[PDB]
């Protein structure tokens, strides 16, 4: 076995001082970030070979970086192309990587990582191979193993070493299962980092100083990891330990409870590799981890999540949907019209960014209740130690509640969040359009009403635009920017820049009925209500939604959306085609909504819907639901219920991609995931088509086949569009 795999520029700089301490400075000249690519593997191979050849004149090693970050991520452009026939190559590649880190780990001399910035995934795995970790406490620095968020696992030793350091349970829950990122202070608190320094200039001096003291104070244990000493005891015990074996069988069941039975193999593979590795020696544990990694990389879910959360998410942030050739325009005062749950969250995320917000409502008591949403979010943030008392005061001081239209002077960014009604929106905009700045953005948080119609109520239609948020605004990351027919490109870029400023992800949607998020989430809820009208058990419908990967089951979501609003969307959709002389086929769910409204069960707000609500708390399904819809008379396979909900949304996304509502699959995938909660293992409602896998096969052709199968059984709404055929 070699330290090389099987041309590229060198990545690692070599420096041996008079004391014998070698400094390896990682500096990939082909990018701003050190990446675990083929150039690194060849570079570290040459460096490790040199450490062995010159072992007699080397007393310590310091691993450093010349970038703003320490080391971030791996070669996604290569991993996403790995086929199942490439499992042998992927295995050999991660085995070569960990063979280099194992040699470095067992040189018989101390190795210190000087972490100057972000050490994520493969970057932290390099530092974990060192005997001591020193981190600089600077802004933006993060540490963690977020491989699971791409459908992967830390295959460069991250699983094996964190389990040896923290035990099976702590490593899984706190580091591996969710890929949590830690700031340098939190990293030292949990043992991921050993000590901190104030600035980056102290790192390499402190690293060499620690080596000098370690050789002097601990000569026998210098360069010896805890799991390489005799008498090593794994924290929390091994699977054969009686205490751990008492709770170990509950680990997969607890994992299956958290994932709600959704089909994501990465957390399952991490847990298996963690436990199986704890039963054997370190080397055998490392090789087991390699096999589970190769299992994930060659799979489809990893390709879906690498596509969505790496390539698609980067293209969006790089300004994919931002109009080219438009400069930056500052925002000084934001004016929010309406202090509801939406308007209050909009004021909070804007002031949390640093903007001055003017929160207007019809009464001062209502506007004060809106700011109370921010006060109660700062109170929960102080009680858990996530902010200071001084920043909370500066945040709330930027929110100025009011009830007078005169307080909108100097406002250059308006965000209306009043009740969904056209006449009400035309009214509140005409009052303030002449009081704001002449270049002020006039935004609307409408979810279904067309933007072109709402823009008529003002004179500066070129600056009227849709800015669609999602409840709760403080926690939802997507902003749906809807472009009316009169909306200019500058207004689009200004709202685009604002979305990034508040830390949210934007998508650009052309004006249409229901936009993209409201229209696609309509098909998901409609499919569930259709199944309820067909006689399917309500408990099975909720199970299908959770096991498909949705964050909330569809009947439960229907109550939070109010069936009264749901009925108005259908009436407007029919009137929007009837008044055009066209044809409108009603969805079978419409009859179910009308009967629930007739029964007075219109959702959670009413106090009763598909569920029962006692004291504002959901408490089981409505017992009369089974007799109302003859529940049990239809028992389709659970996978049919799941596929019906997934395929309806995927087919609707393709329509509104062909209609020009969406302009890129990246907006469709990230829009479905972050906007309405499409299951992340799919990679998005558009990626679901190219990545579908079933008994027929895998790919677009397999999707079309399964869609035609669903259409024959459940209705022509599942017939695949022309654009998906050849």
């Amino acid at each position: 076995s070699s330290h090389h795999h099987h041309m590229p520029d060198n990545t690692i700089q070599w420096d041996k001082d008079a004391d014998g301490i070698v400094t390896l400075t990682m500096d990939d000249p082909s990018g701003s970030t050190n990446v675990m690519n083929e150039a690194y593997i060849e570079s570290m191979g040459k460096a490790v070979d040199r450490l062995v050849a010159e072992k007699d004149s080397i007393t310590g090693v310091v691993v450093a970086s010349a970038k703003k970050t320490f080391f971030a991520g791996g070669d996604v452009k290569t991993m996403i192309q790995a086929r199942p026939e490439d499992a042998g190559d992927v295995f050999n590649t991660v085995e070569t990587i960990k063979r280099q880190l194992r040699t470095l780990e067992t040189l018989g001399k101390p190795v210190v990582a000087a972490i100057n910035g972000a050490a994520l995934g493969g970057g932290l795995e390099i530092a974990l191979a060192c005997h001591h970790r020193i981190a600089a406490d600077v802004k933006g620095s993060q540490l963690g193993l977020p491989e699971v968020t791409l459908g992967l696992l830390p295959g460069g030793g991250g699983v094996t070493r964190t389990v040896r350091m923290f035990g099976i349970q702590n490593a899984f829950v706190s580091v591996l299962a969710q890929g949590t990122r830690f700031k340098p202070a939190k990293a030292k608190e949990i043992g991921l980092v050993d000590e901190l320094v104030a600035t980056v200039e102290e790192l390499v001096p402190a690293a060499k100083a620690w080596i000098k003291e370690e050789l002097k104070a601990n000569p026998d244990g210098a360069g010896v990891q805890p799991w390489d000493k005799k008498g090593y005891k794994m924290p929390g015990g091994t699977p054969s330990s009686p205490g751990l074996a008492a709770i170990l069988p509950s680990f997969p069941s607890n994992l299956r409870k958290q994932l709600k039975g959704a089909p994501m193999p990465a957390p399952r593979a991490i847990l298996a590799a963690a436990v199986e590795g704890a039963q054997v020696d370190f080397d055998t544990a490392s090789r087991i981890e390699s096999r589970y990694f190769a299992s994930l990389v060659t799979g489809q879910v990893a390709k879906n999540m690498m596509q969505a959360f790496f390539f698609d998410l980067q293209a969006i942030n790089a300004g994919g949907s931002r109009p080219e050739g438009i400069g930056k325009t500052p925002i000084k005062r934001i004016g929010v019209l309406g202090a509801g749950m939406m308007g209050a969250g909009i004021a909070y995320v804007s002031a949390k960014a640093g903007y001055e917000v003017v929160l207007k409502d019809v009464s001062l008591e209502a506007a004060a209740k809106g700011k109370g949403y921010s006060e109660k979010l700062e109170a929960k943030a102080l009680e858990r130690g996530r902010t200071t008392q001084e920043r909370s005061d500066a945040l709330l001081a930027r929110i100025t509640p009011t009830a007078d239209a005169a307080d909108f002077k100097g406002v250059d960014f308006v965000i209306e969040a009043v009740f969904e009604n056209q006449e009400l929106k035309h009214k509140v905009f005409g009052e303030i359009e002449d009081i704001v700045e002449p270049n002020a953005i006039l935004g609307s948080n409408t979810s279904t009403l067309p933007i072109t119609g709402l823009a008529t109520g003002v004179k500066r239609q070129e600056d009227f635009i849709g800015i669609h948020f999602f409840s709760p605004v403080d926690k939802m990351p997507l902003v749906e920017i809807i472009k009316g027919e009169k909306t200019s490109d500058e207004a689009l870029a200004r709202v685009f820049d604002y979305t990034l400023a508040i830390g949210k992800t934007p998508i650009v949607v052309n004006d249409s009925r229901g936009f993209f998020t409201s229209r696609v989430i309509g098909t998901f809820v409609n499919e569930a209500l259709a199944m309820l009208g067909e006689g399917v058990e309500p408990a099975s419908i909720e199970q299908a939604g959770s096991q498909a990967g949705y964050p909330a089951p569809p009947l439960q979501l229907s109550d939070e959306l109010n069936l009264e609003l749901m009925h108005k969307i259908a009436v407007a959709t029919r009137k929007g085609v009837e008044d055009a002389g066209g044809t409108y086929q009603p969805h079978p769910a419409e009859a179910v909504v009308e009967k629930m409204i007739e029964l007075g069960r219109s959702g959670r707000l009413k106090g009763a819907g598909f569920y029962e609500y006692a004291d504002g708390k959901r408490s089981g399904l409505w017992p009369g639901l089974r007799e109302t819809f003859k529940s049990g008379s239809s028992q389709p396979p659970l996978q049919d219920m799941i596929d019906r909900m997934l395929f309806a949304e995927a087919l609707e996304t393709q329509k509104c991609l062909d209609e020009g509502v969406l302009t890129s699959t990246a907006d469709a995938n990230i829009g479905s995931i972050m906007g309405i909660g499409f299951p992340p293992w799919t990679g998005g409602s558009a990626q679901f088509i190219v990545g579908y896998s079933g008994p027929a096969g895998t790919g677009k052709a397999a999707f079309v086949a399964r869609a035609r199968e669903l259409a024959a059984a459940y209705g022509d709404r599942f017939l695949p569009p022309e654009s998906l055929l050849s």
Binding site: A245, L248, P249, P252, S253, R256, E276, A539, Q635
Partner: protein
């Protein structure tokens, strides 16, 4: 060809878990004591004719490891040619040993076999042996492992068994186990445990609560997270699991052992043994492994078709009382008359010593067939992982 006959069927009393009389007794001693009782009943038995000793044991570790069946052969002074094999099929290990002994006699390649089981749960708790279905996350995550308790509560939910329904059966088991003891039904089959000095250690079933009331059962509280949601992921038409099973309507954790002597007709003649019953048929089957506790019902169907019999041909039904709902579901599915089901009590009152239970309830029906002068009995047990074993005996 050869017909397998039951010549002897004895068992120890069942000592309770907390502060039980048998805690100080090694499980090996429990088996040796039963071997010595067989010798007392047949002093001129040629033990060289015994070809195998088959013992069921669910936790074969520690005091119960290293082939405890072979240890009993050596410790009791039986000939070294008498073999000794341990087997584990979860709850029906004791009955599988008896059926394996019978199938060994039928094949003509074994003439006289001892079979039974032993479990000292106070000394070797269940789960002590580890296991892959629980301690291998890859296969645990796939098979959706759920403990028998939740599966029993799920059966009561689907079938509509209320908390009062299962507690009503638990009271019936206590009453019938008390009537059987006070009536002398167990006087000849339960062999009291004694020490090396002959002092008495235990002569009765400690777990029994003969003064049980329905009001007392209703005060009991029902029995690691995640298992409840995992069960509903498979049984997705069920919204909520009604947890009705407590310590008062579930089987007891006890210590005990049982022995059965099985041989051919010619073996009984050469040794002056009077046959007590005849093994008519045996069967194995199963059902879903997430809910479990449902394998014995198709195993009962399989053993009836194989013997060419129906429910109305059977005089006594004996199903292990692991949980009250499993017995009530078994009674509904096959329309078993109430006066034919577990007529002398069950594991709810007397305990369920895993590896020995199958041989115990088998010996119980052998005695009750003779006491009533009835003809046929059907013995069956639910099994973890979703299995089931059934046997039909005929009085001789």
């Amino acid at each position: 060809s050869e017909e397998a006959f039951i010549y002897e069927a004895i068992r120890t009393p069942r000592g309770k878990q907390k502060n039980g009389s048998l805690h100080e007794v090694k499980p090996l001693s429990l088996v040796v004591g039963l071997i010595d009782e067989l010798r007392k009943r047949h002093p001129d038995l040629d033990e060289n004719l015994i070809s195998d000793v088959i013992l069921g044991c669910v936790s074969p570790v520690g005091d119960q490891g290293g082939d405890i069946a072979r240890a009993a052969v050596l410790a009791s002074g039986m000939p070294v040619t008498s073999g000794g094999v341990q087997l584990n099929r979860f709850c029906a290990s004791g009955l599988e040993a008896v059926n394996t002994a019978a199938q060994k006699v039928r094949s003509g390649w074994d003439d006289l076999v001892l079979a039974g089981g032993v479990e000292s749960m106070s000394r070797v708790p269940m789960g002590s042996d580890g296991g892959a279905m629980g301690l291998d996350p890859a296969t645990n995550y796939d098979v959706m492992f759920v403990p028998q308790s939740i599966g029993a509560d799920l059966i009561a939910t689907i079938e509509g068994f209320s908390r009062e329904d299962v507690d009503a059966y638990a009271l019936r088991s206590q009453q019938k186990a008390a009537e059987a003891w006070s009536g002398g039904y167990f006087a000849k089959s339960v062999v009291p445990v004694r020490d090396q000095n002959g002092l008495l250690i235990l002569d009765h079933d400690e777990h029994m609560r003969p003064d049980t009331t329905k009001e007392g059962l209703a005060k009991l509280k029902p029995a690691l997270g995640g298992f409840d949601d995992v069960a509903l992921q498979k049984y997705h038409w069920v919204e909520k699991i009604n947890h009705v099973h407590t310590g008062g309507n579930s089987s007891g954790i006890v210590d005990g052992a049982a022995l059965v002597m099985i041989g051919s007709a010619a073996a009984g003649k050469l040794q002056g043994l009077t046959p007590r019953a005849r093994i008519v048929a045996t069967a194995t089957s199963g059902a879903d492994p997430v809910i479990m506790l449902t394998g014995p019902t198709p195993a009962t169907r399989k053993v009836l078709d194989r013997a060419g019999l129906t429910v109305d041909d059977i005089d006594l039904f004996e199903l292990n009382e692991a949980f009250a709902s499993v017995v009530l579901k078994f009674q509904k599915d096959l329309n078993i008359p109430d006066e034919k089901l577990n007529v002398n009590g069950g594991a709810i009152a007397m305990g369920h010593p895993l590896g020995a239970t199958g041989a115990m309830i088998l010996g119980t029906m052998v005695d009750e067939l003779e006491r009533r002068n009835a003809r046929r009995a059907l013995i069956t047990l639910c099994i973890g992982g979703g299995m089931g074993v059934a046997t039909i005996i005929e009085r001789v």
